[PDB]
Short mmCIF file of C-alpha atoms and ligand atoms in Angstrom, two decimals:
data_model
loop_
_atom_site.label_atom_id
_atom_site.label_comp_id
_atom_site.label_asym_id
_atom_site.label_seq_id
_atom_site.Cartn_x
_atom_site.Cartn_y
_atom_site.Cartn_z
CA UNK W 552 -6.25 49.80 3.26
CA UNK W 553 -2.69 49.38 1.81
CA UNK W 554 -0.62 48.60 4.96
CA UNK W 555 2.67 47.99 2.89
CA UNK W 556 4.10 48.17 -0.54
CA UNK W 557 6.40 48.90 -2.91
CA UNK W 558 5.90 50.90 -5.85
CA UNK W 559 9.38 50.50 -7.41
CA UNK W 560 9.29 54.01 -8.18
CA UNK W 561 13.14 54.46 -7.68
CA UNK W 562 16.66 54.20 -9.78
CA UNK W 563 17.48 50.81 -7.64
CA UNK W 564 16.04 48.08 -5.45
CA UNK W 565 15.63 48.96 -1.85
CA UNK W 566 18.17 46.16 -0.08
CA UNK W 567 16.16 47.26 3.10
CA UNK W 568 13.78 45.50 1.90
CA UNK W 569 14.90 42.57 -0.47
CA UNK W 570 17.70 40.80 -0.95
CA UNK W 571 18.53 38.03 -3.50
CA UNK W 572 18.90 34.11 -4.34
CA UNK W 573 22.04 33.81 -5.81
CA UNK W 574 23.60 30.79 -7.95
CA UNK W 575 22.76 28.25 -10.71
CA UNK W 576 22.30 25.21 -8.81
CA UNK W 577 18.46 24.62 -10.13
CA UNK W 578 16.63 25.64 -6.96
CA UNK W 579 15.20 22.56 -6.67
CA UNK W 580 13.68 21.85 -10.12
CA UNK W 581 17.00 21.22 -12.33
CA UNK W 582 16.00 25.26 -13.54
CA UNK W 583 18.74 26.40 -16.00
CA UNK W 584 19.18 30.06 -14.92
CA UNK W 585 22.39 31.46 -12.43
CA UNK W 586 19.94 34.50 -10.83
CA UNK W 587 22.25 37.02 -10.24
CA UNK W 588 22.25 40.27 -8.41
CA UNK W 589 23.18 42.23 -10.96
CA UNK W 590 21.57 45.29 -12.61
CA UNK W 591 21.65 43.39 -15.61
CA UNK W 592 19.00 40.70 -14.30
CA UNK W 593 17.36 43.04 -11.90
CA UNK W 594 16.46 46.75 -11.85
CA UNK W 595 13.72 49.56 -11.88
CA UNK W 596 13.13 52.09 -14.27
CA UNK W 597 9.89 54.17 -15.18
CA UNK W 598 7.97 52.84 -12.09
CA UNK W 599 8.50 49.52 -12.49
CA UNK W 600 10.54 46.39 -11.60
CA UNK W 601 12.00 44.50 -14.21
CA UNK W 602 13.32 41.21 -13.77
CA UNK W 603 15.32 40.09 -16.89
CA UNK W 604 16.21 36.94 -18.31
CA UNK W 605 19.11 36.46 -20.40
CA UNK W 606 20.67 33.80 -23.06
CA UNK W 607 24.36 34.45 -21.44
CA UNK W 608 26.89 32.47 -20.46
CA UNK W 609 27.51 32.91 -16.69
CA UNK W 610 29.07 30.95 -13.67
CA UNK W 611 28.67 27.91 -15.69
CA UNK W 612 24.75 28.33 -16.47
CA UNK W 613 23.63 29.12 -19.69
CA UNK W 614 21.24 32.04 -18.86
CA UNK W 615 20.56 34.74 -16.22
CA UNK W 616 17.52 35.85 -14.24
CA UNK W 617 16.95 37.09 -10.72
CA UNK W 618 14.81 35.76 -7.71
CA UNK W 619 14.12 38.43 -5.04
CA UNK W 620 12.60 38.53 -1.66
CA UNK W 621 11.43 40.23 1.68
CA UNK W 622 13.09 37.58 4.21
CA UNK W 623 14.59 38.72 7.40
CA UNK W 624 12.62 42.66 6.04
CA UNK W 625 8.94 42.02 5.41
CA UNK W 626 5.98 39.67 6.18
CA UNK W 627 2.45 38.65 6.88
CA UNK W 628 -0.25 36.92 8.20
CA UNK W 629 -3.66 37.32 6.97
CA UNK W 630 -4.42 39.81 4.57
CA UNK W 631 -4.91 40.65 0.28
CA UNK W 632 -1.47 40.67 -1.42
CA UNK W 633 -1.93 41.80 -5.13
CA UNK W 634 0.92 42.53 -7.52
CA UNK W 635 0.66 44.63 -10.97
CA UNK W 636 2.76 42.65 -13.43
CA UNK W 637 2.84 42.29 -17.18
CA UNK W 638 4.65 38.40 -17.61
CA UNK W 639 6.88 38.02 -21.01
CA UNK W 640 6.03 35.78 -23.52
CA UNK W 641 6.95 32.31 -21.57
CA UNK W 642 7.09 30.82 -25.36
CA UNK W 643 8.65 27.78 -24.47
CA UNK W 644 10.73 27.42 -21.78
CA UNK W 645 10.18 30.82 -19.81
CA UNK W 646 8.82 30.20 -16.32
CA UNK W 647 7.95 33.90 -14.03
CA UNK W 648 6.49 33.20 -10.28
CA UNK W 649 5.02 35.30 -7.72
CA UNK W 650 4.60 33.21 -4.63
CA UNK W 651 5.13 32.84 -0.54
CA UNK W 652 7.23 30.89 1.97
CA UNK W 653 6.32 30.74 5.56
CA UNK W 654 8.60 32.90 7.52
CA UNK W 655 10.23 29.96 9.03
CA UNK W 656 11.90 28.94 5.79
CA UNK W 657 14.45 28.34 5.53
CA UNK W 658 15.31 27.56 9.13
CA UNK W 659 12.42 25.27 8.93
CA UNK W 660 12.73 23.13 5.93
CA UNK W 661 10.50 23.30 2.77
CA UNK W 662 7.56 22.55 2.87
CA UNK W 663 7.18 22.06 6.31
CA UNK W 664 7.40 25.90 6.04
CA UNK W 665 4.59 26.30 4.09
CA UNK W 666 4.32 27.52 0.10
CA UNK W 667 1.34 29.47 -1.27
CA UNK W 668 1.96 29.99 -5.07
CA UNK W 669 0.01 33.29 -6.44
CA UNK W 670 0.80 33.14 -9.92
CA UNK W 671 2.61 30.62 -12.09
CA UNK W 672 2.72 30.26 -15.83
CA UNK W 673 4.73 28.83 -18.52
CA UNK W 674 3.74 25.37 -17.86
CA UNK W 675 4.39 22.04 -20.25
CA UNK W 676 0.42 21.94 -20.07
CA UNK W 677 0.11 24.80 -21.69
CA UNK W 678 3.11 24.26 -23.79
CA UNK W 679 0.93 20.86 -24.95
CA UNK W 680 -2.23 22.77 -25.38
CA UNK W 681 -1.02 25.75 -27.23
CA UNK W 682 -2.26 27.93 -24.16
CA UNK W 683 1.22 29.51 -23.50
CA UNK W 684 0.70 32.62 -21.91
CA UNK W 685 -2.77 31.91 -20.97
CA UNK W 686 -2.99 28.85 -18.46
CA UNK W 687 -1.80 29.36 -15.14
CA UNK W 688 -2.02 28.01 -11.79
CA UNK W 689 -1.99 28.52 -7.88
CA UNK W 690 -1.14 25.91 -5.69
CA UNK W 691 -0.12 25.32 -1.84
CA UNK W 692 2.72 23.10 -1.32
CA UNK W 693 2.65 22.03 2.43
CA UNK W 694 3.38 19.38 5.39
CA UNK W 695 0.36 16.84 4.46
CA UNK W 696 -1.40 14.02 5.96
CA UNK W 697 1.76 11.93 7.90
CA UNK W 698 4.32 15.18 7.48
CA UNK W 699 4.52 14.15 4.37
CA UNK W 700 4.82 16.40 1.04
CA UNK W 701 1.23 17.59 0.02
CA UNK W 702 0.48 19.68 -3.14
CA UNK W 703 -2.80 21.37 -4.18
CA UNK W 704 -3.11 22.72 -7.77
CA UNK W 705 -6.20 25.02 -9.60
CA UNK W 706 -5.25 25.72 -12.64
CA UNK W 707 -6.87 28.43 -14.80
CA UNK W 708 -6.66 29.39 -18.73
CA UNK W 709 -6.94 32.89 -19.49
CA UNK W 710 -9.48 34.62 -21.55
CA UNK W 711 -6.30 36.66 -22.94
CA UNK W 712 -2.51 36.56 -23.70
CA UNK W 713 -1.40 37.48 -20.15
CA UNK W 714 1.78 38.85 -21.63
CA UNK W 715 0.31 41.39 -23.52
CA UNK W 716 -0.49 44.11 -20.53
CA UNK W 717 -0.55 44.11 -16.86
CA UNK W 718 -2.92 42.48 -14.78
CA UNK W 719 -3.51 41.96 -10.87
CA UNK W 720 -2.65 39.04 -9.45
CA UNK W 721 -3.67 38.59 -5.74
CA UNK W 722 -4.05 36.09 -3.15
CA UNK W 723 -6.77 36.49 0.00
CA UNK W 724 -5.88 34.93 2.74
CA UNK W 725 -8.34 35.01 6.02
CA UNK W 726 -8.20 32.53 9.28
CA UNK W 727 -10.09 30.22 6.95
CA UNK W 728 -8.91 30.67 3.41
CA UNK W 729 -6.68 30.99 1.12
CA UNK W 730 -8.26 32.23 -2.64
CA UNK W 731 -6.58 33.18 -5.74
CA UNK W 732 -7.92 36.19 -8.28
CA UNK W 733 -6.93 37.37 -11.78
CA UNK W 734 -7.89 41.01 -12.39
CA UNK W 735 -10.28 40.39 -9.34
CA UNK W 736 -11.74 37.42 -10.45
CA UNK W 737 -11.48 33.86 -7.75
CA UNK W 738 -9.89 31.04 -10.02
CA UNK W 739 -8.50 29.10 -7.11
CA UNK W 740 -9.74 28.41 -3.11
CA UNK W 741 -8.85 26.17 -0.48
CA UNK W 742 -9.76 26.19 2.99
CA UNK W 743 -6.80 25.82 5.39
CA UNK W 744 -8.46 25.16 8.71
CA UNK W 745 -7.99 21.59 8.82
CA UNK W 746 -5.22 19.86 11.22
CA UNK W 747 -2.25 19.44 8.55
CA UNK W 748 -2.84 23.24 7.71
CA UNK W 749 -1.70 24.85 10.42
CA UNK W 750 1.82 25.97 8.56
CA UNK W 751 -1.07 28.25 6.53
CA UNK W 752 -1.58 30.26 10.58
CA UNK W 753 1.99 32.15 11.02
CA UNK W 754 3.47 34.83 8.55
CA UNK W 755 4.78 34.24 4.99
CA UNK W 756 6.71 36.69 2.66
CA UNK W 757 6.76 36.92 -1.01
CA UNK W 758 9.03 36.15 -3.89
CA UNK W 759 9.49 37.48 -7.42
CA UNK W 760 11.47 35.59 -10.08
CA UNK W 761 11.64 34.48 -13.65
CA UNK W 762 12.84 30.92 -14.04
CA UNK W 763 14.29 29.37 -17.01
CA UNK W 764 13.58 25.39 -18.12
CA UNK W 765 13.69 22.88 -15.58
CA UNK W 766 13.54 19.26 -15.30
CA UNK W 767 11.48 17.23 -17.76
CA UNK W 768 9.38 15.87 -14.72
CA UNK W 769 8.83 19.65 -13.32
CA UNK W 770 7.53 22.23 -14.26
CA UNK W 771 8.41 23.60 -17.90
CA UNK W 772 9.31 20.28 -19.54
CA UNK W 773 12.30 21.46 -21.07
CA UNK W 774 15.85 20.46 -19.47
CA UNK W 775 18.36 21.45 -21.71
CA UNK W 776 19.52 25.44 -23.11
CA UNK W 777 18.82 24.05 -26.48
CA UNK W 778 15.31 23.43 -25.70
CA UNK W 779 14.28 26.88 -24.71
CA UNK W 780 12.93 28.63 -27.24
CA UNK W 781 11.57 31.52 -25.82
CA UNK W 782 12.39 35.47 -26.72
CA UNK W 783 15.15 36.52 -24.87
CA UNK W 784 15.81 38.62 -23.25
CA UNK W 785 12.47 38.15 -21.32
CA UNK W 786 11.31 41.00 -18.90
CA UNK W 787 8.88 40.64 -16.11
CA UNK W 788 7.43 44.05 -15.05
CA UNK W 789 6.42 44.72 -11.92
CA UNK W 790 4.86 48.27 -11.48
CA UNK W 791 3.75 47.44 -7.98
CA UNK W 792 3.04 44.99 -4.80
CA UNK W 793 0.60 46.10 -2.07
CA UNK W 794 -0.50 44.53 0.75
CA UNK W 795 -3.93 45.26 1.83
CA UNK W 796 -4.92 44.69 5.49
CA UNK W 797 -7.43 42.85 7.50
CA UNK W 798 -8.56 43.33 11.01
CA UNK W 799 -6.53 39.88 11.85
CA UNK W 800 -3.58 41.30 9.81
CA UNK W 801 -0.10 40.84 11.53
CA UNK W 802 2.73 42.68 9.96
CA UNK W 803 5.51 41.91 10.76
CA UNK W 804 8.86 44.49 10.06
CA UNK W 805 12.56 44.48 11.29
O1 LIG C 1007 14.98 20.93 -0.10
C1 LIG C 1007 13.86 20.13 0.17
C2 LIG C 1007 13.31 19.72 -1.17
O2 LIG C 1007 13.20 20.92 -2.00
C3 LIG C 1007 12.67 20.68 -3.38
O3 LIG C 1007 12.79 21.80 -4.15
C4 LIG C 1007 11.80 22.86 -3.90
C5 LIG C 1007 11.25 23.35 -5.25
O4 LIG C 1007 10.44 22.31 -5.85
C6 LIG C 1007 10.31 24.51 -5.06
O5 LIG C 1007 9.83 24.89 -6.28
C7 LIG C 1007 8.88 26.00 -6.11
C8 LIG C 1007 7.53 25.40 -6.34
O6 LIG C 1007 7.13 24.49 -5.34
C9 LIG C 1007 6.48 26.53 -6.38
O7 LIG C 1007 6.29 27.05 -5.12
O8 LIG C 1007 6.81 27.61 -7.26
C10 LIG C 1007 8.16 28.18 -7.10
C11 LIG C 1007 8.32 29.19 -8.20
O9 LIG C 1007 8.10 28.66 -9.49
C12 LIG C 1007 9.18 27.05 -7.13
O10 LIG C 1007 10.52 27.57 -7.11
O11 LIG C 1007 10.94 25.60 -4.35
C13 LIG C 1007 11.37 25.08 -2.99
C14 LIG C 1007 11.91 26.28 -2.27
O12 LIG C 1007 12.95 26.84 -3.00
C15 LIG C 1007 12.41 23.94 -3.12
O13 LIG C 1007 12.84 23.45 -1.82
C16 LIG C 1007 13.52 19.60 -4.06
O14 LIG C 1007 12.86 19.25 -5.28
C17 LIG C 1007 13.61 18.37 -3.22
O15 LIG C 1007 14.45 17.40 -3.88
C18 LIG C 1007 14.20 18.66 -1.88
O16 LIG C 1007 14.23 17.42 -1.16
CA1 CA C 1008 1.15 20.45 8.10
CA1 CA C 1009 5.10 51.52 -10.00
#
């Protein structure tokens, strides 16, 4: 029962529906991209969405990218949300995301708000292992025990080169749960009923971006434009996001 999506069918993003992080600033993890809202880093042709990476030099930053999302236009609580997407080759340095804030952020302050990541790869694990493009992860990043920062993180390597076709990547998300699924397989679940959960019980939207490097301590390992080393330009397609509902599903649309 597909309650809401978009199919990115069009010649341009719907701004009824998304709007855009703009700047260079890191976003919290020293990244090395200035997302932009340009059709250069952001745009649909042949039924997809492609956000595109860039080696360019721009507002001071080294590379471009986009980060898009539903605030203030779309969100949920309770339900499936799966997205069709075919990753680039993360090589080293490349670092896509699809993954949810509560619907308080950023009023509330992260991660008070609540963070539910669905899909992230392009890690320094992988980078280590030689599992680029293969190991990924989901995590929550929450209020914990004492307010205080609390992260949970499955991660999962790939029978295949994710880059090399689309697959579905989908969180489900009941009352008591929240699981993770490639291609409609669990690799990740946590319950969320316990007390410092409760951020996990009010709606969250989604966001779609391709990060580049970040801090040695976070997430890619590499800090520097010299140390990426991955194909650009990188494209993340996106043929499609769908939310499927639940009884307990509340939508929520202005
Ligand atoms: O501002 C409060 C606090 O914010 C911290 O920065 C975080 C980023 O760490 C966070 O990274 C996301 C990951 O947690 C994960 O959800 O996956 C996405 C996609 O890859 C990441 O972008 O994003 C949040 C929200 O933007 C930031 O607030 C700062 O590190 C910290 O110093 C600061 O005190
Ligand atoms: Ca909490
Ligand atoms: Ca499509």
């Amino acid at each position: 029962n597909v309650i809401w999506s978009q199919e990115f069918d069009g010649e341009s993003l719907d701004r009824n529906v998304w709007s855009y992080d703009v700047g260079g600033h890191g976003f919290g993890n020293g990244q090395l991209e200035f997302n932009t809202d340009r059709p250069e880093n952001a745009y649909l042709r042949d039924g997809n969405l492609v956000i595109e990476a860039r080696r360019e030099a721009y507002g001071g930053n080294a590379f471009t990218s986009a980060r898009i999302h539903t605030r203030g236009r779309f969100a949920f609580q309770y339900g499936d949300l799966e997205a069709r997407i075919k990753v680039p080759d993360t090589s080293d340095g490349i670092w896509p995301a699809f993954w949810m804030l509560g619907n308080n952020f950023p009023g509330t302050v992260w991660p008070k708000c609540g963070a539910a990541d669905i899909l992230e790869i392009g890690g320094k694990d992988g980078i280590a292992k030689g599992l680029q493009n293969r190991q990924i992860n989901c995590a929550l990043h929450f209020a914990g025990v004492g307010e205080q920062k609390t992260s949970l993180v499955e991660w999962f390597d790939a029978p295949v080169d994710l880059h090399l076709d689309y697959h579905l990547y989908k969180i489900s998300w009941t009352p008591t749960h929240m699981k993770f699924f490639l291609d409609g397989k669990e690799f990740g679940s946590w319950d969320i009923t316990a007390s410092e959960m409760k951020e996990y019980h009010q709606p969250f939207y989604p966001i779609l971006n391709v990060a580049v490097g970040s801090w040695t301590h976070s997430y890619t390992g590499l800090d520097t434009p010299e140390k990426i080393t991955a194909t650009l330009p990188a494209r993340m397609y996106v043929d499609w996001i769908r939310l499927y509902g639940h009884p307990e599903t509340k939508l929520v649309q202005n």
